């Protein structure tokens, strides 16, 4: 039917970088 | 030579009772252009640590 | 005490700031704005 | 006791039109 150097720590700490990415406008 | 610039740092403050703060001078530049990394203490005019 | 059974129940009350409209402020740009998207330069001819 | 302050309100003396002359937007 059907088919299928380490030291600086405080300073250093302190010189970390804060990067923010940038933004592109639509 | 002469009139070489040394660069240094410090941290943590001071204590109570403490007088002197421990600086660590980091590199220094020749007027050449020479560079060495020396990471030495550095003291007062006699010497003194700090 | 009951006094200080009061003052350390309702002692730590965060302040509160009431800035007005019409104020004028700034706005401090964190990162670089790209606008290249969205506008483009054309010359006007003279005349 | 202290509450907070009102924005300035405007003195109601010195009353002039805001239109000295007719704008083009409206075409005139």
């Known amino acids: ?26 | 030579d002469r009139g070489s610039k040394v660069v240094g740092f410090y941290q943590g403050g001071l204590r109570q009772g403490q007088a002197r703060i421990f600086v660590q001078w980091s590199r220094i530049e020749t007027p050449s252009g020479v560079v060495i990394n020396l990471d030495s203490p550095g003291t007062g005019p006699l010497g003194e640590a700090g | 005490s009951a006094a200080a059974e009061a003052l350390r129940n309702s002692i730590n009350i965060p302040p509160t700031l009431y800035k007005n409209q019409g104020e004028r402020v700034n706005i401090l740009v964190a990162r670089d704005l790209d606008f290249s998207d969205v506008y483009s330069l054309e010359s006007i001819p003279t005349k | 006791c202290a509450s907070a302050p009102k924005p300035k309100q405007p003195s109601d003396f010195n009353r002039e039109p805001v239109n000295k002359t007719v704008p083009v937007e409206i075409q005139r």
């Open chain 1, 1 to 26: 039917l059907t088919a299928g150097g380490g030291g600086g720590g405080e300073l250093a700490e302190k010189l970390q970088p804060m990067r923010l990415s940038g933004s592109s406008a639509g």
